[PDB]
């Protein structure tokens, strides 16, 4: 009732204007993605381009905070998520046939527009992607299609969790264990009402059954693996952090209090990459105190087993009265992907046509 | 007082009911082929509506939800409302039978009604041909015309008149007298109506009306290859509705615990006698209740034999942005080849949009 | 007090007028070919707007509705406002003529403006080529760019800038100083505007502005193959509107009758003098009115001989969910072939979004 919701016209407007920016930046990055291109440069180019487009809009309103809601992340092949390298980490260079996931977020007055898309580097004109890339992309895309049709008022998060497994299984792929699609609110990317992928027995017990309601907003995030689908750390350095507002702890230092002060000014409660910090070695230091006492929440770089592919589609959807209204999406082309398998289940075939 | 589609929660309830009506409808059309029992299709629909409405808005333990119009499957010259009792005659679908499937869903009284015509087992790569195609094309283009004419500021009469020229283009006739009703919460049979191809008496019996924003209509197209009169052929009537504008103490003991059941289970929504524990006790307790006008019947009317009746029924919300259709059959216009076409310049332009 | 698209009923009236402007424009486009009197097309289009508005919202008796901009048919290097008197030189359409059709509808003073460019009797399965295709493609890609840029948070200036880049790609120029007005109830000419290719001086005078939800714009793209200037040519002016801010008791009695017929038939919307039966009394009524600033003239304007001007106008509502276009013409892009194309990477991507 105090809360600013998509029940209000001005809020739909901010969501729609960040959505349009998220869609433009994503597409620009996909067009710039070819053999020999630096991932570091695409992460920099996206974060810069988010800032510049947020710069040009709502100029009359000089108090409104706007920018990055999720820093541009570029996770290739069996890498799951959250790769925004530092100027001094090893870079990754896109090879032909590389499977690329681009993930990013934009906000306007704290209303968050999250988008992620998967494609293949320099697919030869007149060909189709085939084999396990085709199987896992096709599968993740149909998972996003089933969620667009199931995440609506009156349905339960559990029905989406199950639809996802039957769809992914149809391609002998596997939704990554325990990943979460969060409810969004003003200034909150990580709402506690969630959809869980492919939960274990522990995760199924600890995760809360919920019913979607009109006026809620979700960042639906589909991550599907060609393999077993349990992501592991593999000592890549975490660059992406979020401040956790739920945690106080006075910091016994000078640098730490000073780094965690630039995190609050420049970013408040949104995720940020350690690369966005002018002076690298100084940020690398101010993080350790903060991260161990949980004031910052890490976004770790997880990997599936070498040779396997992970595909991603993330879209932000507003549960408007008239029906779910999608405000971000990638330039997916269904005809580019040939799989030898399809969905055989009659209920899911009919749902995906609906 | 009246809850209208100017409330965000009401639109939501209409859409969740239509998503369900659309799903049960298609699942019934997939299940329809040579040798399946209409009885079992009617049982399957009604059970799918109850399962689907069972799964939604479950945090809201108190909310009524379920059948707004029990599944009816009216074949060839049958016009509507055929939902056989288990103890009556069944009907087995044949190849080339023209099938109308009518059903409705409600969520907290907000009704989503749909109906659709197809032909049984159309051989792959074949096209329906002849009178069946004429009348299915006609009824559909009558629905396309209504979708574009049922909008705020227009009159019911403009819709009546467009249906007459669209259906004459295929030498078909809208069945005279048939009504398309305004819907409101708990009301399937609003007084505000679109009439088809009315007689001079029916014209004077029926009120010109103007569509207004925030209204809901179950638009209902029934077009015949014949006459366009629908006559009783004494099939037993299986579908009745409580008439909430009516009292009567009733007296006979079966009668009162019968009508006690229709009030507990179905409140104001149409129901089939097939839905009772004992179809015989139900046929008996109706006979008192219906005489005294506490139940309206939904009669099975029939055209002349060898003639064909097509139906498309969709529920539409007159939203500010434009008509928002929440139900529809899966129409494929490529299935149907007619030697005739709509040729009126002004209706061709309407249908193109 | 002011009625905005935040009201369900306002959005409805805009949509009902848009639906009509679309129907009329298309009918006029179909009716344009070699030998067609431009006078007849102006008559036909004004008569259609009155017939179509005559049929809607009949039960609301006090509700004013009809023409927001009289059908104007501006050919080749004519820019705008050609609506000849019965007694003027008529223009007969020739094969290969570039035609601009511009008209408006109002429902209760909610305005739906549209304009469309096409080429007369394009040879079946050819393509228009040369300057006519250059300028029609430039104007359409300008209209497409406006539709994606005129939205809450953006600046009228970014549109102005996109329009010189997009048009320069075809060696075409948006006509210097032409305006796209905000619309409100009974106001065709709101002060918040998008300016085309402003002069030196015009930039000083024109206000920068941010677009916001709930605003309405009649986006008017006017593009020239030549310099992008538009001069008078003492062609009779025929279109005027009443300035509702000026009031004056008139001396002569023909003048007052003239005024009464203007106020009654056209409130404060532009009208053509062609709509007055007594052509003489009206030309005399005007000079007393126009003398005392009671009418503002809409003068006919021309680019140079042999040059071509294209126009796409559309009326858009900045709803919360995104711009909602309620008018458009039937553009078929595959009809126009140009040696040139938009080569800026950001405009390429903006035009595909």
UniProtKB/Swiss-Prot annotation, chain A:
The lineage of its organism: Eukaryota, Metazoa, Chordata, Craniata, Vertebrata. Residues 1-42, 295-354 are annotated as: Necessary for nucleolar localization. Belongs to the peptidase M24 family. GO terms for biological process: negative regulation of apoptotic process; negative regulation of DNA-templated transcription; positive regulation of cell differentiation; regulation of translation; rRNA processing. SUPFAM superfamilies: Creatinase/aminopeptidase, Winged helix' DNA-binding domain. Isoform 2 is undetectable whereas isoform 1 is strongly expressed in cancer cells (at protein level). Isoform 1 and isoform 2 are widely expressed, including heart, brain, lung, pancreas, skeletal muscle, kidney, placenta and liver. The keyword Nucleus applies. PANTHER family: PROLIFERATION-ASSOCIATED PROTEIN 2G4, PROTEASE FAMILY M24 METHIONYL AMINOPEPTIDASE, AMINOPEPTIDASE P. May play a role in a ERBB3-regulated signal transduction pathway. Seems be involved in growth regulation. Acts a corepressor of the androgen receptor (AR) and is regulated by the ERBB3 ligand neuregulin-1/heregulin (HRG). Inhibits transcription of some E2F1-regulated promoters, probably by recruiting histone acetylase (HAT) activity. Binds RNA. Associates with 28S, 18S and 5.8S mature rRNAs, several rRNA precursors and probably U3 small nucleolar RNA. May be involved in regulation of intermediate and late steps of rRNA processing. May be involved in ribosome assembly. Isoform 2 interacts with the cytoplasmic domain of non-phosphorylated ERBB3; the interaction requires PKC activity. Interacts with AR. Treatment with HRG leads to dissociation from ERBB3 and increases association with AR. Interacts with NCL/nucleolin. Component of a ribonucleoprotein complex containing at least PA2G4, NCL, TOP1, PABPC2, RPLP0, acetylated histone H1 (HIST1H1A or H1F1), histone H1 2/4, RPL4, RPL8, RPL15, RPL18, RPL18A, RPL21, RPL11, RPL12, RPL28, RPL27, RPLP2 and RPL24. Interacts with HDAC2. Interacts with RB1; the interaction is enhanced upon PA2G4 dephosphorylation. Keywords: Acetylation, Cytoplasm, Isopeptide bond, Nucleus, Phosphoprotein, Repressor, Ribonucleoprotein, RNA-binding, rRNA processing, Transcription, Transcription regulation, Translation regulation, Ubl conjugation. The keyword Chloroplast does not apply. InterPro entries: Creatinase/aminopeptidase-like, PA2G4, PA2G4/ARX1, Pept_M24, Pept_M24A_MAP2_BS, WH-like_DNA-bd_sf, WH_DNA-bd_sf. GO terms for cellular component: azurophil granule lumen; cytoplasm; extracellular exosome; extracellular region; membrane; nucleolus; nucleus; ribonucleoprotein complex. GO terms for molecular function: nucleic acid binding; RNA binding; transcription corepressor activity; ubiquitin protein ligase binding. There is a cross-link at residue 292 (Glycyl lysine isopeptide (Lys-Gly) (interchain with G-Cter in SUMO2)). Residues 40-48 are annotated as: RNA-binding. This is Proliferation-associated protein 2G4. The modification Phosphoserine is found at residue 329.
From Swiss-Prot, chains B, C:
GO terms for cellular component: azurophil granule lumen; cytoplasm; extracellular exosome; extracellular region; membrane; nucleolus; nucleus; ribonucleoprotein complex. The keyword Zinc-finger does not apply. Transmembrane segments: none annotated. Keywords: Acetylation, Cytoplasm, Isopeptide bond, Nucleus, Phosphoprotein, Repressor, Ribonucleoprotein, RNA-binding, rRNA processing, Transcription, Transcription regulation, Translation regulation, Ubl conjugation. There is a cross-link at residue 291 (Glycyl lysine isopeptide (Lys-Gly) (interchain with G-Cter in SUMO2)). InterPro entries: Creatinase/aminopeptidase-like (IPR036005), PA2G4 (IPR004545), PA2G4/ARX1 (IPR047113), Pept_M24 (IPR000994), Pept_M24A_MAP2_BS (IPR018349), WH-like_DNA-bd_sf (IPR036388), WH_DNA-bd_sf (IPR036390). This is Proliferation-associated protein 2G4. It comes from Homo sapiens.
């Amino acid at each position: 009732q105090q809360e600013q919701t998509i029940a209000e016209d001005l809020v739909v407007t901010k969501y729609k204007m960040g959505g349009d920016i998220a869609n433009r930046v994503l597409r620009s990055l996909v067009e710039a993605s070819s053999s020999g291109v630096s991932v570091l440069s695409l992460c920099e180019k996206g974060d810069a381009m988010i800032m510049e487009e947020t710069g040009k809009i709502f100029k009359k309103e000089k108090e409104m905070k706007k920018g990055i809601a999720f820093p541009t992340s570029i996770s290739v092949n069996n890498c799951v998520c959250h790769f925004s390298p530092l100027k001094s980490d090893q870079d990754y260079i896109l090879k032909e046939g590389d499977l690329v996931k681009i993930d990013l977020g934009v906000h306007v007055d704290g209303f968050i527009a999250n988008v992620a898309h998967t494609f293949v580097v320099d697919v030869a004109q007149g060909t189709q992607v085939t084999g396990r890339k085709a199987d896992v992309i096709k599968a993740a895309h149909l998972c996003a299609e089933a969620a667009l049709r199931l995440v609506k008022p009156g349905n339960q998060n559990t029905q989406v969790t199950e639809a996802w497994n039957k769809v992914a299984h149809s391609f002998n792929c596997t939704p990554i264990e325990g990943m979460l699609s969060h409810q969004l609110k003003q200034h909150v990317i990580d709402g506690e009402k969630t959809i869980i992928q492919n939960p274990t027995d522990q995760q199924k017990k600890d995760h809360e059954k919920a019913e979607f309601e009109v006026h809620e907003v979700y960042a639906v995030d589909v991550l599907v693996s060609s393999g077993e689908g349990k992501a592991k750390d593999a000592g890549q350095r975490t660059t992406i952090y979020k401040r956790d507002p739920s945690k106080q702890y006075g910091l016994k230092m000078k640098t730490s209090r000073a780094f965690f002060s630039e995190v609050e000014r420049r970013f408040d409660a949104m995720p940020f990459t350690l690369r966005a910090f002018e002076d690298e070695k100084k940020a690398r230091m101010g993080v350790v105190e903060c991260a161990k006492h949980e004031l910052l929440q890490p976004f770790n770089v997880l990997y599936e087993k070498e040779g396997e592919f992970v595909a991603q589609f993330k879209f932000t959807v507003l549960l408007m009265p008239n029906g779910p209204m999608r405000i971000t999406s990638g330039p997916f082309e269904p005809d580019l992907y040939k799989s030898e398998m399809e969905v055989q289940d009659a209920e899911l075939k009919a749902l995906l046509q609906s």
